[PDB]
């Protein structure tokens, strides 16, 4: 059980931790979040009572250090920072708990939701998509653009997701134009899985991280990335059976966790109807297909 203390809460803000969130009032005595489950990545995020644009937040793993939050009045936002002085850190954390000014990470014991949404997300891979190697945690917000989006402007602030493009030389072998465009198995298994991602867990991890960024910050390019990685599998005639079954579980918990009122910008009508109903893999997503019908039949 780990802790992330906060120095203060100077401005009214809604604080999120993973899929939980709390309202905190201007200069309320709030000094952190305790009982955070070790063993997974986590994300703590923010939305000011005054600017309901620009949701932002930090990806972290508590095994990698002691982290805390502090408001910066020059830059106007809650910043994550690292404390290298171990004793000084436990001293702050203990005194705040004794005074009981920290909320408890509110996990239900039956609940595998966060594990299921983060199964394959690793902090080391996050740090390659969000390159800022002087911090051990990663910042993302609503407005950050992806590397693919920039090709069609500030690279320090980019999401360096893997670029997928169905009408590219990379995806299409000379002489197999028709074959490789109707049946992306070669782009999936040779180029992407064997070539770039090396194995499917890294692929699934980028997929899952892209979804969480769309969900928690409404990052539009992440939403585009998530739909692309889904489409590439569903459009490949030849997929390892283990990936198919794992994909059905991954998507199910994503669809399950989505806020009901966001299904309009976050779910691409074309991709989902193609995957569930036209693609090679229409019959391999039984759980995902069942929850989509019973919860968003409008879209279909």
């Amino acid at each position: 059980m780990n802790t992330v203390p906060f120095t203060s809460a100077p401005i009214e803000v809604t604080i999120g931790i993973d899929q939980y969130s709390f309202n905190v009032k201007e200069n309320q005595p709030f000094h952190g979040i305790k009982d955070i489950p070790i063993g997974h990545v986590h994300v703590i995020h923010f939305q000011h009572a005054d600017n309901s644009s620009m949701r932002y937040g930090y990806w972290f793993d508590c095994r990698m250090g002691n982290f805390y939050i502090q408001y910066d009045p020059k830059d106007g936002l809650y910043k994550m920072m690292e404390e290298r002085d171990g004793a000084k850190f436990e001293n702050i954390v203990h005194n705040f708990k004794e005074r009981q000014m920290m909320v408890s990470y509110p996990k239900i014991d039956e609940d595998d939701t966060w594990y299921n949404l983060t199964e394959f997300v690793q902090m080391d891979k996050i740090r390659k998509i969000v390159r800022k190697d002087e911090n051990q945690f990663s910042y993302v917000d609503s407005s950050m653009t992806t590397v693919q989006e920039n090709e069609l402007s500030d690279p320090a602030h980019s999401l360096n997701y893997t670029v997928i493009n169905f009408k590219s030389r990379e995806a299409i072998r000379p002489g197999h134009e028709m074959e490789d465009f109707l049946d992306k198995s070669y782009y999936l298994n040779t180029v992407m899985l064997q070539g770039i991602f090396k194995n499917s867990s890294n692929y699934f991890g980028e997929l899952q991280f892209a979804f969480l960024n769309a969900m928690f910050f409404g990052n539009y390019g992440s939403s585009l990335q998530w739909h692309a990685m889904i489409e590439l599998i569903c459009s490949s005639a030849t997929v390892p059976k283990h990936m198919l079954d794992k994909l059905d579980e991954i998507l199910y918990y994503q669809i399950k966790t989505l806020p009901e009122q966001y299904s309009d910008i976050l779910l691409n009508e074309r991709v989902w109807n193609i995957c569930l109903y036209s693609s090679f893999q229409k019959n391999s997503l039984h759980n995902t297909e069942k929850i989509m019908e019973n919860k968003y039949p409008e879209l279909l």
Binding site: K167, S168, R169, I172, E177, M178, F181
Partner: protein, 237 residues
Amino acid sequence: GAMNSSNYAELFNNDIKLFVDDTNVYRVTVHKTFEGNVATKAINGCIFTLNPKTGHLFLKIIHTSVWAGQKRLSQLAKWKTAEEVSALVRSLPKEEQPKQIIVTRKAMLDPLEVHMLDFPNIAIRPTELRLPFSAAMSIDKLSDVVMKATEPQMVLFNIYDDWLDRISSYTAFSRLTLLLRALKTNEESAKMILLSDPTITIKSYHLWPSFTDEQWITIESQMRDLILTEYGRKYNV
């Protein structure tokens, strides 16, 4: 973007462009089998690739042998069209390659796009115009060379005969599409109009009769009248 009535005169500038029409690539007859079921039989086809400024036509003959033992033929036709257009571009010297290719049917966008990945500075465009290039097999000499072919073969033609010696590309193309529109709505009458007078012949190296300027005016009037009649008939107006 898409080609429509607004940006129509762009056809006649000095950017090389081609139209590609795939309507006659995969041609079938439908008949009944001994046991009563229905079967198709393929006949020879053609890609219609045309430079609307110069008249040059690249008529790529599509011999039935290409379908042998293949499935999903109507979908394959689109990919075979694109493969052949792409090889034609590759065979032309650099300064003759087009800057744009305009497909008469939007289903050809994705296949051509994929086949042209090697030519990223060639723009592939749809059109909103309802061009009548499917009536090309109504031109007697084009249908004749397609039907007689025994192997794949490319045949070259100037679809404007010698008209550009006396009129502009704009006017040449408006005559060509009016003749072809007429041939499409009522082939029998269209061809009657063109041939009624045995004293106007087709040169051996030409596709259309050798009308004088005044005789072309009478013909164009006769083709207009044909097209409007057939419209009243269709719609009861």
